[PDB]
Design a protein around this nucleic acid. Structure first.
Length: 436
RNA sequence: GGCCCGGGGCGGUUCGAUUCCGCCCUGGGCCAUC
């Protein structure tokens, strides 16, 4: 039963004694170093609140700087401090650069920010974190394991990140939720009633109907904590909660198995479907995933839209990325279509336009049907692939800034066996609902 | 970078385009980076 299950579960979410110990002693040292320099700092994030998921140990040391300090100063002093304190560093990037390193074996993020008073004055997302922490530390105390359960559950099902490769629940949203419902289970139970118009005002302990799923930030009533949660990911969670409660099981916290498929069986199935399955391959632009995937979606969407207005009847689109290349995957109901198609002309009494419409030299002689004129025109292409080869070659600039630029210099359309031999077999099966 | 809203020019397509497909400059808002 749920309880017995959640019990066996804490085991997969809570960091064991050694992963914890490792943490403390790393924070211990990290503390000394920072003081033997008299720097004004503050640990934030899931480490400072013991809400960190097992296996995801990382520390977040935020450096407080006067308001008056310039942007440049912040990062320079931040770069210096980070460098001196970290065993081994690495200048990372975001809204502004910050430093990432390791201390006594554990991960560390040394972010520079402005010491501020009261939410307004907020100069960057990072400035807001300190407030999020002060508001969260006193209220989440004693429920950390509820937070963890809720992450292992979301992480296990592929919707734990808030970044563009996940579009799911952010760890912050997770604690706010636990602070609202009181525990994992209560969150799971209530989530089942969530709709796309549900709004959760943590500060008001109230739930209301809005225009979109909105979890108003305690620190900023205008900020949506679940802003980048995809409408489909929300749907998948609402369902996942409904099923968990129907049949509790430790399997919900266990990362689903990769489940490889033999390319041969994939071939058979596509045949059983008798659809057009092809891919658009091009070199992976060298850019962070936060810029790459929002592009892959656009590109994939722009082509899907080309395919349907072109009468190829697309079923679903998808995409995969590698160290090497990127793939846009499509499946259609039409492997081929006739050359001729019917073009709609003016009504019979509009002498002006009628004449014009008839003034074009076509090959088949237009006709009248139910009051208006029509014409038989020929298509430029007759198969999905044939069309996308044309679309990608001329409309490359609309598939994203980067993706669009790598397609402009090189792209190929694969299909048949050649396609099943590309590292995209898994994605396809997920796209076709192939079950097993 | 991506999404939402808006201005100013254009190109292709169409009997017919503000309205479909796209391109230039361009104002504001939001999202991820912790």
């Amino acid at each position: 039963k749920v309880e017995e299950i959640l019990e066996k579960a804490l085991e997969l979410v809570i960091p064991d004694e050694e992963e914890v110990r490792k943490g403390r002693e790393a924070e211990e040292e990290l503390r000394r170093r920072l003081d033997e320099l008299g720097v004004e700092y503050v640990f934030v994030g899931s480490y400072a609140r013991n809400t960190w998921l097992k296996g995801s140990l990382e520390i977040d040391v935020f450096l407080l700087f006067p308001e008056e300090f310039s942007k440049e100063e912040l990062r320079e002093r931040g770069l210096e401090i980070g460098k001196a304190v970290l065993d081994s560093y690495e200048i990372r990037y975001a809204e502004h650069p910050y430093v990432h390193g390791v201390v006594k074996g554990v991960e560390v993020d040394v972010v520079p920010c402005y010491k501020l008073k009261e939410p307004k004055n907020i100069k960057s997302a990072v400035d807001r974190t300190p407030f999020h922490h002060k508001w969260l530390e006193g209220r989440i105390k004693g429920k950390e394991n509820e937070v963890r359960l809720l992450k292992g559950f979301l992480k296990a099902n592929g919707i734990y990140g808030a970044e563009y490769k996940v579009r799911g629940f952010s760890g912050y949203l997770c604690e706010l939720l636990i602070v609202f419902y009181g525990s994992f289970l209560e969150t799971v139970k209530n989530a089942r009633r969530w709709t796309r118009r549900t709004v959760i005002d943590v500060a008001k302990g109230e739930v209301r109907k809005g225009e979109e799923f909105f979890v108003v930030d305690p620190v900023d009533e205008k900020r949506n904590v679940a802003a980048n949660l995809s409408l489909d990911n929300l749907a998948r969670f609402v369902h996942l909660c409904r099923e968990f409660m129907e049949a509790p099981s430790l399997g919900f916290f266990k990362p689903k198995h990769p489940l490889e498929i033999e390319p041969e069986r994939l071939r058979k199935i596509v045949e059983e479907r008798g659809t057009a399955v092809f891919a658009v391959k091009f070199r992976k632009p060298d850019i962070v995933d936060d810029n790459l995937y929002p592009q892959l979606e656009r590109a994939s969407r722009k082509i899907f839209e080309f395919l349907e207005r072109e009468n190829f009847m697309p079923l679903r689109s998808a995409f995969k990325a590698s160290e090497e290349f990127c793939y846009l995957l499509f499946e259609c109901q039409i492997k081929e279509i006739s050359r001729v198609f019917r073009r709609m002309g003016p009504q019979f009494e509009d002498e002006r336009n009628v004449k014009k419409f008839l003034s074009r030299n076509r090959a088949f002689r237009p006709f009248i049907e139910n009051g208006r004129w029509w014409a038989f025109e020929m298509r430029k292409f007759t198969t999905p692939e044939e069309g996308v080869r044309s679309y990608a070659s001329t409309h490359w600039h609309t598939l994203g800034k980067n993706v669009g630029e790598s397609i402009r210099e090189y792209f190929e359309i694969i299909s048949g066996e050649k396609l099943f031999k590309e590292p995209v077999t898994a994605e396809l099966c997920e796209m076709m609902g192939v079950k097993d």
